[PDB]
Amino acid sequence: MRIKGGKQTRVRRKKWLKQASGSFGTRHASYKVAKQTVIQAAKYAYRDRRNKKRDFRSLWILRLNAALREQGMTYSVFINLLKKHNIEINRKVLSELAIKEPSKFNLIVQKVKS
Amino acid sequence: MKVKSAAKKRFKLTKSGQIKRKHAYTSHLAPHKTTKQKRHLRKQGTVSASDFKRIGNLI
Amino acid sequence: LNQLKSVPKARNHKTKTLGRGHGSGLGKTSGRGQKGQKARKSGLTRPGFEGGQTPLYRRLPKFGNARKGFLKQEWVVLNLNKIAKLKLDKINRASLIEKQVISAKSQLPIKLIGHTKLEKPLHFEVHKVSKQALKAVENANGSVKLLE
Amino acid sequence: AKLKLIKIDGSFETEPVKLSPGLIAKELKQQPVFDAVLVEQASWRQGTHSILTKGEVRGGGKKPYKQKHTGKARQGSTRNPHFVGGGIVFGPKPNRNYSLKLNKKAHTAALHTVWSEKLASDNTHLVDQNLFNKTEGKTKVMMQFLKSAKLLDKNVLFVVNTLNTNLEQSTSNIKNVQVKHLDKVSVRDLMLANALLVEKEVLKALEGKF
RNA sequence: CGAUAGAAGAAGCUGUUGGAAAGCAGCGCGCAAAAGGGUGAUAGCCCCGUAUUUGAAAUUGUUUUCAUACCUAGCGAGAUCCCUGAGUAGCUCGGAAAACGUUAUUUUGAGUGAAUCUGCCCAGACCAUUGGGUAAGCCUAAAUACUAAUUAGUGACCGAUAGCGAAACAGUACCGUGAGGGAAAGGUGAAAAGAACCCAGAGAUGGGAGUGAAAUAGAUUCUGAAACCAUAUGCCUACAACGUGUCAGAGCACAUUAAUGUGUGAUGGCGUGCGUUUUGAAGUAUGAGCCGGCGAGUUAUGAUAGCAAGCGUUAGUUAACCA
RNA sequence: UUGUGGUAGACGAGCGUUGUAUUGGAGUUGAAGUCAAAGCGUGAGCAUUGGUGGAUCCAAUACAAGUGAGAAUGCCGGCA
């Protein structure tokens, strides 16, 4: 009862190598190497998915504090102004996108006056 | 399988398990032993639960 | 059922893999650990082997059997509590072999046993009898004749 | 239960027969039936597959490599299961019986049960020994009778106890139909056929056999 | 009764796409046969064959009967008449077989050596009684292992890396002097129906051309995967410190299992392989060039534990053996 | 409500392939195999389509594996 699994192994390696593409040179030509490349790429993609949300808030803090200190006030001042009175849910990204919205940031700065 | 000839010569089997063993140290000198030890070692006992895992697999 | 719908109920219990696959685990020694004598192929301990410790049999004295070279004669024992389930009356070896309490192509000495009182008088033809069993069967109005 | 005899005219007989309630099953156990049909399927091997072990293969006693100075595997044996010499280390052997012991108590209980269902499956049509008389071994008349009985949908089994010759002179040129003795039948055979004809005389004997 | 030669043996047309129809569909028949094989793609009815009906001059095998060789033959009675298997049984020195590592019993290399069925042997030292049989001569079909093969058939057998080393002209080629060890590899096609004829070229070879349904069937002749070699559509790369990629993303060219699409990325952030064994390796610890197949927890028996079932308080269950 | 770090290791539930067996179907009006493309899946996998391809398969269920390849200074073969 000889049982051959050549076709099964070939199909498995084919579907494994189908994921790997666009590598450097011959790297997307070896099954064993491409396996490690795919696994490492997946792990690093998970890491980037975990940390991009971590760094985007800091990016928006930079991009908004630029405008704030251009008006003569730190990002800390804006956070305090939001904190004590008239607490808003407007996100740091959306408040950063208000820069992309013309004639809007002035409305916020005049509104937060107290 | 076969039953260990050397082992079976020293352990009896009672109802519902409780393999009966023997007591050693009856060889040489009574004066090295006390009266209670001499009168109690004559009684025979049964291997412990921890020992039972090493007795059940033996036979 | 049918050969297209043949299904079990609780059969096909879980198995163990010892040399196939690691994503599902159990592709290594699979329960033997790493770097051990038992972990090697056919690595185990002999029943008398205890890692260097003296085997248990050679640490304790041995039994002595006066019935050495002698085979004890077996005795079919008739306990009153158990034979109460038996409906046989006027007991003799001829009737017992018909009820397969003893093999038909065999004859063995019969012993009476058990103080469990019964409530019917019968005829007993046995070879041995216990004193308390004898009292129990004589007080039950049954007749007992000892055979030899 | 009750069943009506069928005739050579392709129709049931106008006289039904009473069947004792002691034959119809009242405790349906199909897992024992599954085991019985397995044991019918089991013990069907022929010991045709085999393999050679490490010592069963031939070859010289040469050592491919010495104790040292080799940049590859030590390879101290001339033949190995992974070498080109072949031979699976375990493989099949012509000694694996693969036979399962079954007790006749549960087997007979399940057999009586399945016979009860098959006699009450509506697929059975009672026949007799008389109609096969004046008939010959020609499969033409047999095929015509089956077409009238429209039993070609499933394999038709012919339980035989008196060995009418015309029955075995037929059912060989056709695929679905076959003949076997009352004892020779099996639960697997009964369920696989799903169509059958019963002589009127083996009823009492089958019920006594239970 | 067979075998070693052999014979007979039933049942279709139309259309269909297809080179080719037997497949497919309709209308028919068929029988001891619709087992199987071949016949242009898997034919119950094209052919062989099969079931079935039969046949052996000569040779050879098996069984029975008959005439017959050879063999064996009962019952009594008298008699302290004679005999019944000697270097024999045995005892001792070393042994061995016996489950037995020398113990009843049996055998002897060495020594010794009875009685005559009134006797002996044995009844695991031995002794008495008792029981049984009288060694010291021989033969023995029957159930028994086994296939080297023949005949017919089968394979919940392997399909050219497997299966005998050997599908192929295989223990051949080949090696060591030599004992000895010990190779690889099958598939055109349907019929060669083998590429006619022409052109370049010395030819090989190639291109048209033809046979052929098809030359993605051209002898490297079922297909032609992976590793590897090029080739160009489009994009990018010659200030460039990255286990080489991720998250994004300008622009460019497109347009799919139509979907926030694909390819690709000037540039920003981030990021020191896989198994391995160790307390542990990006490791200057080891292995791995890569690719393709192959490649390593089975089985026979028995026990235990778990779950389910059958039976179930003397039931269950048969080992073996037989149909 | 606890939740979904984890080696050894324990435990549970499944998938893929071959064959056997029954119920089915497709197939020179193209099967498998192969390559490719811009799918579905928690994954074992399942597809769909294009063409090579030229005659085999797939679907549902139990039974049994020479059953599931990432290395073994792994075996052979091919290739730099």
UniProtKB/Swiss-Prot annotation, chain A:
GO terms for cellular component: ribonucleoprotein complex; ribosome
CDD domains registered for this protein in UniProt: Ribosomal_L20
Pfam families the UniProt entry points to: Ribosomal_L20 (PF00453)
Gene Ontology MF term list: rRNA binding; structural constituent of ribosome
Superkingdom to which the source organism belongs: Bacteria
Protein's GO biological process: ribosomal large subunit assembly; translation
Keywords carried by this UniProt record: Ribonucleoprotein, Ribosomal protein, RNA-binding, rRNA-binding
NCBIfam families: rplT_bact (TIGR01032)
Known function: Binds directly to 23S ribosomal RNA and is necessary for the in vitro assembly process of the 50S ribosomal subunit. It is not involved in the protein synthesizing functions of that subunit.
HAMAP family (alphabetical): Ribosomal_bL20
Family of this protein: Belongs to the bacterial ribosomal protein bL20 family.
Protein name as annotated: Large ribosomal subunit protein bL20
Provenance organism: Mycoplasma pneumoniae (strain ATCC 29342 / M129 / Subtype 1) (Mycoplasmoides pneumoniae)
Lineage: Bacteria, Bacillati, Mycoplasmatota, Mycoplasmoidales, Mycoplasmoidaceae
The encoding gene: rplT
UniProtKB/Swiss-Prot annotation, chain B:
The gene coding this protein: rpmI
GO cellular component: cytosolic large ribosomal subunit
Region (Disordered): 1-22, 30-49
Listed Basic residues bias regions: 30-43
GO biological process: translation
The protein's name: Large ribosomal subunit protein bL35
Keyword Acyltransferase: no
One Pfam family this sequence matches: Ribosomal_L35p
Keywords per UniProt: Ribonucleoprotein, Ribosomal protein
Gene Ontology molecular-function annotations: structural constituent of ribosome
Disulfide bond entries: none
Family: Belongs to the bacterial ribosomal protein bL35 family.
Gene3D superfamilies from the UniProt entry: 4.10.410.60
From Swiss-Prot, chain C:
Biased composition (Gly residues): 20-34
GO biological process assignments: translation
Keyword RNA-binding on entry: yes
Entry GO CC: cytosolic large ribosomal subunit
Span list, region Disordered: 1-56
GO molecular function: rRNA binding; structural constituent of ribosome
Keywords of this entry: Ribonucleoprotein, Ribosomal protein, RNA-binding, rRNA-binding
Bias (Basic residues): 8-19
Pfam families in the cross-refs: Ribosomal_L27A
Subunit and interaction comment: Part of the 50S ribosomal subunit.
Family: Belongs to the universal ribosomal protein uL15 family.
Job description of the protein: Binds to the 23S rRNA.
Protein name: Large ribosomal subunit protein uL15
Curated annotation (Swiss-Prot), chain D:
Pfam families, per database record: Ribosomal_L4
Effect of H69L: After 32, 37 and 48 antibiotic passages; confers resistance to various antibiotics in combination with a 23S rRNA mutation and up to 3 mutations in protein L22
Entry keywords, A to Z: Antibiotic resistance, Ribonucleoprotein, Ribosomal protein, RNA-binding, rRNA-binding
Ranges annotated as biased composition (Basic residues): 60-72
Residue spans crossing the bilayer: none
Chain residue ranges for the region called Disordered: 54-85
Listed GO MF terms: rRNA binding; structural constituent of ribosome
GO BP, sorted A to Z: response to antibiotic; translation
Any one GO cellular component localisation term in the record: ribosome
PANTHER family, alphabetized: 50S RIBOSOMAL PROTEIN L4, LARGE RIBOSOMAL SUBUNIT PROTEIN UL4M
Function: One of the primary rRNA binding proteins, this protein initially binds near the 5'-end of the 23S rRNA. It is important during the early stages of 50S assembly. It makes multiple contacts with different domains of the 23S rRNA in the assembled 50S subunit and ribosome. Forms part of the polypeptide exit tunnel.
Subunit structure: Part of the 50S ribosomal subunit.
Similarity section: Belongs to the universal ribosomal protein uL4 family.
Official protein name in the record: Large ribosomal subunit protein uL4
Originating organism: Mycoplasma pneumoniae (strain ATCC 29342 / M129 / Subtype 1)
